[PDB]
Design a protein around this ligand. Sequence first.
Ligand SMILES: O=Cc1ccc(Oc2ccc(Cl)cc2Cl)c(O)c1
Ligand SMILES: O=Cc1ccc(Oc2ccc(Cl)cc2Cl)c(O)c1
Lengths: 115, 115, 115, 115
Amino acid sequence: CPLMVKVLDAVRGSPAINVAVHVFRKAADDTWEPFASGKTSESGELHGLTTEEEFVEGIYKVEIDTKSYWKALGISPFHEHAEVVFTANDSGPRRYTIAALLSPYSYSTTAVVTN
Amino acid sequence: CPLMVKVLDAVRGSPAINVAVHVFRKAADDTWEPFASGKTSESGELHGLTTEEEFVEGIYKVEIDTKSYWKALGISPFHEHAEVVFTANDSGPRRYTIAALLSPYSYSTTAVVTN
Amino acid sequence: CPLMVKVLDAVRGSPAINVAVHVFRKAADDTWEPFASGKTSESGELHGLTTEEEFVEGIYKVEIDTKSYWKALGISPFHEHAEVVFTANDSGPRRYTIAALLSPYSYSTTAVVTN
Amino acid sequence: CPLMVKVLDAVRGSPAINVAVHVFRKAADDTWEPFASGKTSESGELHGLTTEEEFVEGIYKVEIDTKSYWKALGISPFHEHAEVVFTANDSGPRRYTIAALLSPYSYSTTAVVTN
Ligand SMILES: O=Cc1ccc(Oc2ccc(Cl)cc2Cl)c(O)c1
Ligand SMILES: O=Cc1ccc(Oc2ccc(Cl)cc2Cl)c(O)c1
Protein backbone atom coordinates (compact mmCIF):
# COMPACT_ATOMS: atom_id res chain seq x y z
CA CYS A 1 0.00 0.00 0.00
CA PRO A 2 2.00 3.02 -1.18
CA LEU A 3 -1.02 5.37 -1.26
CA MET A 4 -3.73 5.62 1.45
CA VAL A 5 -6.45 8.11 2.14
CA LYS A 6 -7.97 8.86 5.50
CA VAL A 7 -10.90 11.18 6.11
CA LEU A 8 -12.34 12.61 9.37
CA ASP A 9 -15.60 14.54 10.02
CA ALA A 10 -15.05 17.64 12.22
CA VAL A 11 -18.84 18.16 12.89
CA ARG A 12 -19.56 14.63 14.10
CA GLY A 13 -16.09 13.96 15.58
CA SER A 14 -15.87 10.70 13.74
CA PRO A 15 -14.30 9.03 10.72
CA ALA A 16 -15.99 10.09 7.47
CA ILE A 17 -17.55 6.84 6.30
CA ASN A 18 -18.34 5.97 2.74
CA VAL A 19 -16.79 8.97 1.15
CA ALA A 20 -16.07 8.39 -2.57
CA VAL A 21 -12.39 9.08 -3.51
CA HIS A 22 -11.15 9.30 -7.11
CA VAL A 23 -7.45 9.44 -7.96
CA PHE A 24 -6.12 10.68 -11.34
CA ARG A 25 -2.71 10.71 -12.93
CA LYS A 26 -1.64 13.50 -15.25
CA ALA A 27 -1.11 12.12 -18.84
CA ALA A 28 1.45 13.50 -21.42
CA ASP A 29 -1.32 15.70 -23.05
CA ASP A 30 -2.00 17.28 -19.64
CA THR A 31 -5.36 15.69 -19.09
CA TRP A 32 -6.20 13.79 -15.94
CA GLU A 33 -6.77 10.14 -16.40
CA PRO A 34 -8.60 7.92 -13.94
CA PHE A 35 -6.14 5.92 -11.89
CA ALA A 36 -7.82 4.46 -8.81
CA SER A 37 -11.00 4.96 -6.73
CA GLY A 38 -12.98 3.66 -3.82
CA LYS A 39 -15.06 4.65 -0.76
CA THR A 40 -13.72 5.10 2.77
CA SER A 41 -14.43 2.27 5.22
CA GLU A 42 -16.05 2.43 8.71
CA SER A 43 -12.66 3.64 9.89
CA GLY A 44 -12.73 6.50 7.35
CA GLU A 45 -9.78 4.85 5.58
CA LEU A 46 -9.37 3.71 2.02
CA HIS A 47 -6.65 1.08 1.44
CA GLY A 48 -5.73 -0.87 -1.70
CA LEU A 49 -6.04 2.03 -4.18
CA THR A 50 -2.87 0.91 -5.94
CA THR A 51 0.36 -1.15 -5.88
CA GLU A 52 4.04 -0.21 -5.81
CA GLU A 53 4.36 -1.40 -9.42
CA GLU A 54 1.62 0.91 -10.70
CA PHE A 55 2.32 3.98 -8.52
CA VAL A 56 5.24 5.44 -10.55
CA GLU A 57 6.59 8.95 -10.24
CA GLY A 58 4.23 11.48 -11.78
CA ILE A 59 1.61 14.06 -10.84
CA TYR A 60 -1.53 12.79 -9.16
CA LYS A 61 -4.83 14.31 -8.15
CA VAL A 62 -6.90 12.90 -5.28
CA GLU A 63 -10.45 14.15 -5.29
CA ILE A 64 -12.52 13.56 -2.15
CA ASP A 65 -16.30 13.83 -2.93
CA THR A 66 -17.12 15.95 0.10
CA LYS A 67 -20.37 17.47 -1.27
CA SER A 68 -22.11 14.11 -1.55
CA TYR A 69 -20.88 13.12 1.93
CA TRP A 70 -22.49 16.21 3.56
CA LYS A 71 -25.73 15.90 1.59
CA ALA A 72 -26.24 12.34 2.72
CA LEU A 73 -26.11 13.74 6.30
CA GLY A 74 -28.66 16.60 5.58
CA ILE A 75 -25.99 19.30 5.98
CA SER A 76 -25.40 22.10 3.46
CA PRO A 77 -21.85 22.08 2.05
CA PHE A 78 -19.81 24.70 0.32
CA HIS A 79 -17.23 22.80 -1.80
CA GLU A 80 -17.86 20.51 -4.75
CA HIS A 81 -15.03 18.33 -3.53
CA ALA A 82 -11.65 18.49 -1.80
CA GLU A 83 -8.68 18.12 -4.21
CA VAL A 84 -5.14 17.15 -3.33
CA VAL A 85 -2.57 17.52 -6.24
CA PHE A 86 1.05 16.47 -5.74
CA THR A 87 4.12 14.97 -7.39
CA ALA A 88 4.97 11.47 -6.27
CA ASN A 89 8.70 10.89 -6.46
CA ASP A 90 11.14 8.19 -5.36
CA SER A 91 13.81 9.54 -3.01
CA GLY A 92 13.65 6.21 -1.13
CA PRO A 93 11.02 3.73 0.22
CA ARG A 94 7.84 5.82 0.66
CA ARG A 95 4.21 5.36 1.73
CA TYR A 96 1.91 8.40 1.15
CA THR A 97 -1.12 8.96 3.40
CA ILE A 98 -3.36 11.74 2.30
CA ALA A 99 -5.35 12.86 5.33
CA ALA A 100 -8.35 15.17 5.28
CA LEU A 101 -10.51 16.79 7.99
CA LEU A 102 -13.89 18.03 6.75
CA SER A 103 -16.29 20.80 7.86
CA PRO A 104 -19.17 22.04 5.74
CA TYR A 105 -17.37 25.22 4.79
CA SER A 106 -13.77 24.29 5.45
CA TYR A 107 -11.29 21.45 5.03
CA SER A 108 -7.69 20.67 5.73
CA THR A 109 -5.53 18.09 4.08
CA THR A 110 -2.10 16.86 5.10
CA ALA A 111 0.38 14.45 3.58
CA VAL A 112 2.10 11.97 5.80
CA VAL A 113 5.09 10.55 3.89
CA THR A 114 6.79 7.69 5.77
CA ASN A 115 9.50 4.93 5.65
CA CYS B 1 -4.19 47.44 19.01
CA PRO B 2 -1.31 45.08 19.77
CA LEU B 3 -3.66 42.06 20.33
CA MET B 4 -6.69 41.16 18.20
CA VAL B 5 -8.71 37.95 18.12
CA LYS B 6 -10.66 36.72 15.06
CA VAL B 7 -13.05 33.74 15.16
CA LEU B 8 -14.79 32.00 12.22
CA ASP B 9 -17.49 29.29 12.08
CA ALA B 10 -16.50 26.35 9.81
CA VAL B 11 -20.10 24.95 9.79
CA ARG B 12 -21.81 28.08 8.58
CA GLY B 13 -18.92 29.75 6.75
CA SER B 14 -19.40 32.91 8.62
CA PRO B 15 -17.69 34.97 11.32
CA ALA B 16 -18.33 33.55 14.79
CA ILE B 17 -20.30 36.40 16.38
CA ASN B 18 -20.61 37.04 20.11
CA VAL B 19 -17.92 34.62 21.16
CA ALA B 20 -16.59 35.30 24.67
CA VAL B 21 -12.81 35.54 24.95
CA HIS B 22 -10.77 35.80 28.17
CA VAL B 23 -7.08 36.64 28.22
CA PHE B 24 -4.88 35.72 31.16
CA ARG B 25 -1.23 36.51 31.91
CA LYS B 26 1.01 34.23 33.93
CA ALA B 27 1.94 35.99 37.24
CA ALA B 28 5.13 36.07 39.32
CA ASP B 29 3.67 33.31 41.52
CA ASP B 30 3.10 31.05 38.47
CA THR B 31 -0.69 31.75 38.51
CA TRP B 32 -2.99 32.71 35.58
CA GLU B 33 -4.22 36.17 36.28
CA PRO B 34 -7.01 38.02 34.41
CA PHE B 35 -5.62 40.36 31.82
CA ALA B 36 -8.46 41.30 29.55
CA SER B 37 -11.75 39.98 28.04
CA GLY B 38 -14.45 40.73 25.50
CA LYS B 39 -16.87 39.34 22.87
CA THR B 40 -16.40 39.09 19.12
CA SER B 41 -18.33 41.55 16.94
CA GLU B 42 -20.49 40.84 13.83
CA SER B 43 -17.22 40.60 11.86
CA GLY B 44 -16.09 37.87 14.28
CA GLU B 45 -13.29 40.17 15.51
CA LEU B 46 -12.41 41.39 19.00
CA HIS B 47 -10.59 44.73 19.08
CA GLY B 48 -9.40 46.95 21.98
CA LEU B 49 -8.50 44.17 24.38
CA THR B 50 -5.30 46.01 25.45
CA THR B 51 -2.87 48.87 24.71
CA GLU B 52 0.78 48.80 23.90
CA GLU B 53 1.46 50.15 27.44
CA GLU B 54 -0.33 47.39 29.29
CA PHE B 55 0.64 44.49 26.96
CA VAL B 56 4.06 43.80 28.39
CA GLU B 57 6.35 40.78 27.85
CA GLY B 58 4.91 37.64 29.37
CA ILE B 59 3.17 34.30 28.87
CA TYR B 60 -0.45 34.84 27.83
CA LYS B 61 -3.42 32.53 27.49
CA VAL B 62 -6.31 33.40 25.20
CA GLU B 63 -9.28 31.29 26.13
CA ILE B 64 -12.04 31.25 23.51
CA ASP B 65 -15.32 30.08 24.92
CA THR B 66 -16.26 27.72 22.07
CA LYS B 67 -18.66 25.48 24.10
CA SER B 68 -20.88 28.42 25.03
CA TYR B 69 -20.90 29.47 21.38
CA TRP B 70 -22.06 26.10 20.06
CA LYS B 71 -24.62 25.48 22.85
CA ALA B 72 -26.22 28.86 22.11
CA LEU B 73 -26.65 27.42 18.61
CA GLY B 74 -28.19 23.98 19.73
CA ILE B 75 -24.98 22.05 19.11
CA SER B 76 -23.36 19.96 21.84
CA PRO B 77 -19.64 20.28 21.08
CA PHE B 78 -16.59 18.31 22.23
CA HIS B 79 -14.33 21.04 23.66
CA GLU B 80 -14.82 23.18 26.76
CA HIS B 81 -12.95 26.00 25.03
CA ALA B 82 -10.03 26.74 22.81
CA GLU B 83 -6.93 27.80 24.68
CA VAL B 84 -4.03 29.53 22.97
CA VAL B 85 -0.81 29.92 25.08
CA PHE B 86 2.21 31.87 23.96
CA THR B 87 5.06 34.14 25.05
CA ALA B 88 4.55 37.68 23.84
CA ASN B 89 6.85 40.61 23.12
CA ASP B 90 9.92 38.70 24.08
CA SER B 91 11.88 40.28 21.19
CA GLY B 92 10.27 43.71 21.58
CA PRO B 93 6.60 44.80 20.98
CA ARG B 94 4.78 43.12 18.13
CA ARG B 95 1.18 43.06 16.86
CA TYR B 96 -0.54 39.74 17.40
CA THR B 97 -3.69 38.41 15.72
CA ILE B 98 -4.92 35.16 17.16
CA ALA B 99 -7.27 33.48 14.67
CA ALA B 100 -9.49 30.49 15.42
CA LEU B 101 -11.67 28.42 13.10
CA LEU B 102 -14.38 26.42 14.88
CA SER B 103 -16.28 23.13 14.21
CA PRO B 104 -18.21 21.20 16.80
CA TYR B 105 -15.50 18.51 17.36
CA SER B 106 -12.50 20.50 16.12
CA TYR B 107 -10.70 23.80 15.93
CA SER B 108 -7.59 25.32 14.48
CA THR B 109 -5.80 28.39 15.62
CA THR B 110 -3.05 30.38 13.95
CA ALA B 111 -1.12 33.46 15.02
CA VAL B 112 -0.23 36.26 12.56
CA VAL B 113 2.54 38.36 14.11
CA THR B 114 3.68 41.63 12.53
CA ASN B 115 6.47 44.34 12.80
CA CYS C 1 -15.62 42.89 -4.55
CA PRO C 2 -17.73 39.73 -4.62
CA LEU C 3 -14.64 37.41 -4.51
CA MET C 4 -11.55 37.90 -2.32
CA VAL C 5 -8.74 35.47 -1.54
CA LYS C 6 -6.64 35.59 1.66
CA VAL C 7 -3.54 33.44 2.21
CA LEU C 8 -1.49 33.00 5.43
CA ASP C 9 1.83 31.23 6.13
CA ALA C 10 1.59 28.78 9.07
CA VAL C 11 5.43 28.44 9.32
CA ARG C 12 6.20 32.12 9.66
CA GLY C 13 2.91 33.34 11.13
CA SER C 14 2.58 35.96 8.53
CA PRO C 15 0.47 36.76 5.48
CA ALA C 16 1.59 34.77 2.44
CA ILE C 17 2.77 37.57 0.13
CA ASN C 18 3.02 37.34 -3.65
CA VAL C 19 1.12 34.11 -3.99
CA ALA C 20 -0.23 33.53 -7.51
CA VAL C 21 -3.92 32.67 -7.71
CA HIS C 22 -5.84 31.58 -10.82
CA VAL C 23 -9.62 31.36 -10.95
CA PHE C 24 -11.39 29.20 -13.51
CA ARG C 25 -15.09 28.76 -14.30
CA LYS C 26 -16.57 25.55 -15.63
CA ALA C 27 -17.82 26.14 -19.23
CA ALA C 28 -20.85 24.85 -21.16
CA ASP C 29 -18.63 22.14 -22.68
CA ASP C 30 -17.57 20.92 -19.19
CA THR C 31 -14.11 22.58 -19.53
CA TRP C 32 -12.25 24.81 -16.99
CA GLU C 33 -11.98 28.19 -18.56
CA PRO C 34 -9.85 31.12 -17.29
CA PHE C 35 -11.90 33.56 -15.29
CA ALA C 36 -9.50 35.75 -13.42
CA SER C 37 -6.03 35.77 -11.75
CA GLY C 38 -3.72 37.82 -9.57
CA LYS C 39 -1.10 37.81 -6.75
CA THR C 40 -1.62 38.36 -3.04
CA SER C 41 -0.49 41.70 -1.59
CA GLU C 42 1.67 42.37 1.52
CA SER C 43 -1.47 41.75 3.60
CA GLY C 44 -1.75 38.32 1.96
CA GLU C 45 -5.02 39.41 0.30
CA LEU C 46 -6.07 39.46 -3.35
CA HIS C 47 -8.72 42.07 -4.18
CA GLY C 48 -10.37 43.11 -7.49
CA LEU C 49 -10.40 39.69 -9.11
CA THR C 50 -13.95 40.28 -10.49
CA THR C 51 -17.08 42.48 -10.38
CA GLU C 52 -20.60 41.63 -9.46
CA GLU C 53 -21.50 41.85 -13.20
CA GLU C 54 -18.97 39.30 -14.37
CA PHE C 55 -19.20 36.91 -11.38
CA VAL C 56 -22.27 35.00 -12.49
CA GLU C 57 -23.68 31.70 -11.15
CA GLY C 58 -21.39 28.79 -11.91
CA ILE C 59 -18.83 26.27 -10.67
CA TYR C 60 -15.53 27.99 -9.91
CA LYS C 61 -12.07 26.72 -9.13
CA VAL C 62 -9.59 28.86 -7.21
CA GLU C 63 -6.13 27.47 -7.71
CA ILE C 64 -3.56 28.81 -5.25
CA ASP C 65 -0.03 28.26 -6.44
CA THR C 66 1.41 27.00 -3.13
CA LYS C 67 4.39 25.08 -4.64
CA SER C 68 5.77 28.18 -6.33
CA TYR C 69 5.38 30.06 -3.05
CA TRP C 70 7.36 27.55 -0.99
CA LYS C 71 10.08 26.98 -3.63
CA ALA C 72 10.69 30.74 -3.79
CA LEU C 73 11.38 30.37 -0.06
CA GLY C 74 13.82 27.30 -0.36
CA ILE C 75 11.23 24.79 0.82
CA SER C 76 10.32 21.74 -1.27
CA PRO C 77 6.63 21.23 -0.49
CA PHE C 78 4.26 18.29 -1.01
CA HIS C 79 1.40 19.87 -2.99
CA GLU C 80 1.40 21.25 -6.53
CA HIS C 81 -1.22 23.80 -5.47
CA ALA C 82 -4.30 24.25 -3.40
CA GLU C 83 -7.51 23.94 -5.37
CA VAL C 84 -10.82 25.19 -4.03
CA VAL C 85 -13.95 24.18 -6.06
CA PHE C 86 -17.42 25.45 -5.35
CA THR C 87 -20.74 26.54 -6.87
CA ALA C 88 -21.25 30.27 -6.57
CA ASN C 89 -24.27 32.55 -6.51
CA ASP C 90 -26.68 29.72 -6.87
CA SER C 91 -29.09 31.36 -4.39
CA GLY C 92 -28.45 34.90 -5.65
CA PRO C 93 -25.23 37.04 -5.45
CA ARG C 94 -23.12 36.66 -2.34
CA ARG C 95 -19.68 37.88 -1.22
CA TYR C 96 -17.12 35.12 -1.00
CA THR C 97 -13.78 35.13 0.85
CA ILE C 98 -11.68 32.09 0.20
CA ALA C 99 -9.05 31.76 2.94
CA ALA C 100 -6.07 29.38 2.87
CA LEU C 101 -3.50 28.60 5.54
CA LEU C 102 -0.29 27.04 4.21
CA SER C 103 2.39 24.65 5.60
CA PRO C 104 4.86 22.73 3.49
CA TYR C 105 3.00 19.36 3.69
CA SER C 106 -0.47 20.71 4.51
CA TYR C 107 -3.09 23.35 3.96
CA SER C 108 -6.54 24.28 5.10
CA THR C 109 -9.06 26.39 3.31
CA THR C 110 -12.30 27.91 4.53
CA ALA C 111 -14.95 30.00 2.81
CA VAL C 112 -16.64 32.97 4.56
CA VAL C 113 -19.82 33.81 2.63
CA THR C 114 -21.85 36.93 3.41
CA ASN C 115 -25.26 38.64 2.58
CA CYS D 1 -7.54 2.16 25.55
CA PRO D 2 -10.31 4.73 26.02
CA LEU D 3 -8.04 7.75 25.43
CA MET D 4 -5.40 8.05 22.65
CA VAL D 5 -3.43 10.94 21.29
CA LYS D 6 -2.06 11.22 17.79
CA VAL D 7 0.16 14.03 16.54
CA LEU D 8 1.27 14.96 12.99
CA ASP D 9 3.91 17.48 11.77
CA ALA D 10 2.62 19.69 8.90
CA VAL D 11 6.15 21.02 8.00
CA ARG D 12 7.84 17.64 7.66
CA GLY D 13 4.73 15.71 6.50
CA SER D 14 5.33 13.07 9.09
CA PRO D 15 4.17 11.82 12.47
CA ALA D 16 5.39 14.06 15.31
CA ILE D 17 7.73 11.73 17.18
CA ASN D 18 8.60 11.99 20.82
CA VAL D 19 6.25 14.76 21.69
CA ALA D 20 5.59 14.93 25.46
CA VAL D 21 1.83 14.81 26.32
CA HIS D 22 0.45 15.56 29.81
CA VAL D 23 -3.18 14.90 30.72
CA PHE D 24 -4.90 16.52 33.73
CA ARG D 25 -8.24 16.02 35.39
CA LYS D 26 -10.11 18.89 37.00
CA ALA D 27 -10.36 18.33 40.83
CA ALA D 28 -13.29 19.56 43.08
CA ASP D 29 -11.27 22.75 44.03
CA ASP D 30 -10.92 23.58 40.32
CA THR D 31 -7.24 22.87 40.06
CA TRP D 32 -5.82 20.56 37.44
CA GLU D 33 -4.30 17.42 38.75
CA PRO D 34 -1.86 15.25 36.84
CA PHE D 35 -3.62 12.23 35.43
CA ALA D 36 -1.51 10.56 32.74
CA SER D 37 1.49 11.38 30.49
CA GLY D 38 3.85 10.00 27.93
CA LYS D 39 5.68 10.73 24.64
CA THR D 40 4.39 9.93 21.15
CA SER D 41 5.92 6.90 19.45
CA GLU D 42 7.56 6.63 15.97
CA SER D 43 4.00 6.55 14.64
CA GLY D 44 3.22 9.86 16.41
CA GLU D 45 0.76 7.96 18.63
CA LEU D 46 0.55 7.65 22.37
CA HIS D 47 -1.38 4.61 23.66
CA GLY D 48 -1.84 3.30 27.21
CA LEU D 49 -2.41 6.69 28.90
CA THR D 50 -5.23 5.23 30.99
CA THR D 51 -7.77 2.43 31.54
CA GLU D 52 -11.57 2.30 31.37
CA GLU D 53 -11.68 1.97 35.17
CA GLU D 54 -9.71 5.18 35.75
CA PHE D 55 -11.13 7.32 32.92
CA VAL D 56 -14.40 8.39 34.63
CA GLU D 57 -16.63 11.22 33.52
CA GLY D 58 -15.09 14.59 34.32
CA ILE D 59 -13.23 17.47 32.69
CA TYR D 60 -9.81 16.72 31.27
CA LYS D 61 -7.01 18.78 29.80
CA VAL D 62 -4.54 17.33 27.30
CA GLU D 63 -1.46 19.45 26.88
CA ILE D 64 0.79 18.69 23.91
CA ASP D 65 4.33 20.15 24.48
CA THR D 66 4.66 21.61 21.00
CA LYS D 67 7.33 24.24 21.84
CA SER D 68 9.90 21.63 22.88
CA TYR D 69 9.10 19.54 19.79
CA TRP D 70 9.87 22.46 17.40
CA LYS D 71 13.00 23.52 19.28
CA ALA D 72 14.50 20.06 19.03
CA LEU D 73 14.12 20.46 15.22
CA GLY D 74 15.77 23.99 15.13
CA ILE D 75 12.49 25.68 14.18
CA SER D 76 11.09 28.75 15.96
CA PRO D 77 7.63 28.12 17.46
CA PHE D 78 4.90 30.43 18.56
CA HIS D 79 2.86 28.48 21.17
CA GLU D 80 3.97 27.24 24.57
CA HIS D 81 1.88 24.14 24.00
CA ALA D 82 -1.35 22.97 22.41
CA GLU D 83 -4.19 22.41 24.93
CA VAL D 84 -7.31 20.34 24.44
CA VAL D 85 -9.98 20.70 27.26
CA PHE D 86 -13.17 18.63 27.14
CA THR D 87 -15.78 16.80 29.21
CA ALA D 88 -15.62 13.05 29.00
CA ASN D 89 -19.06 11.54 29.46
CA ASP D 90 -20.65 8.10 29.13
CA SER D 91 -23.50 8.07 26.61
CA GLY D 92 -22.38 4.56 25.59
CA PRO D 93 -19.14 2.62 24.80
CA ARG D 94 -16.63 5.32 23.76
CA ARG D 95 -12.98 5.61 22.71
CA TYR D 96 -11.60 9.20 22.46
CA THR D 97 -8.75 10.00 20.04
CA ILE D 98 -7.38 13.45 20.35
CA ALA D 99 -5.66 14.30 17.07
CA ALA D 100 -3.40 17.27 16.46
CA LEU D 101 -1.67 18.70 13.37
CA LEU D 102 1.21 21.06 14.15
CA SER D 103 2.82 24.02 12.32
CA PRO D 104 5.19 26.46 13.98
CA TYR D 105 2.57 29.18 14.18
CA SER D 106 -0.63 27.18 13.90
CA TYR D 107 -2.27 23.97 15.08
CA SER D 108 -5.50 22.10 14.71
CA THR D 109 -6.94 19.52 17.01
CA THR D 110 -9.87 17.20 16.44
CA ALA D 111 -11.67 14.66 18.58
CA VAL D 112 -12.58 11.35 17.09
CA VAL D 113 -15.14 9.68 19.38
CA THR D 114 -15.94 6.10 18.32
CA ASN D 115 -17.82 2.83 19.19
O1 LIG E 1 -5.68 17.84 7.24
C1 LIG E 1 -5.69 17.88 8.46
C2 LIG E 1 -5.80 16.61 9.30
C3 LIG E 1 -6.01 15.38 8.68
C4 LIG E 1 -6.11 14.22 9.44
C5 LIG E 1 -5.99 14.29 10.82
O2 LIG E 1 -6.08 13.15 11.56
C6 LIG E 1 -5.18 12.24 11.11
C7 LIG E 1 -4.72 12.31 9.81
C8 LIG E 1 -3.80 11.37 9.35
C9 LIG E 1 -3.34 10.37 10.19
CL1 LIG E 1 -2.20 9.20 9.62
C10 LIG E 1 -3.81 10.30 11.50
C11 LIG E 1 -4.73 11.23 11.96
CL2 LIG E 1 -5.31 11.15 13.59
C12 LIG E 1 -5.77 15.51 11.44
O3 LIG E 1 -5.65 15.57 12.80
C13 LIG E 1 -5.68 16.67 10.68
O1 LIG F 1 -7.78 27.80 6.76
C1 LIG F 1 -7.90 29.02 6.59
C2 LIG F 1 -7.74 29.99 7.76
C3 LIG F 1 -7.87 31.36 7.55
C4 LIG F 1 -7.73 32.24 8.61
C5 LIG F 1 -7.45 31.76 9.89
O2 LIG F 1 -7.31 32.63 10.92
C6 LIG F 1 -6.82 33.81 10.46
C7 LIG F 1 -5.45 34.03 10.40
C8 LIG F 1 -4.96 35.24 9.93
C9 LIG F 1 -5.84 36.24 9.52
CL1 LIG F 1 -5.22 37.74 8.94
C10 LIG F 1 -7.21 36.02 9.58
C11 LIG F 1 -7.70 34.81 10.06
CL2 LIG F 1 -9.41 34.55 10.13
C12 LIG F 1 -7.31 30.40 10.10
O3 LIG F 1 -7.04 29.92 11.34
C13 LIG F 1 -7.46 29.51 9.04
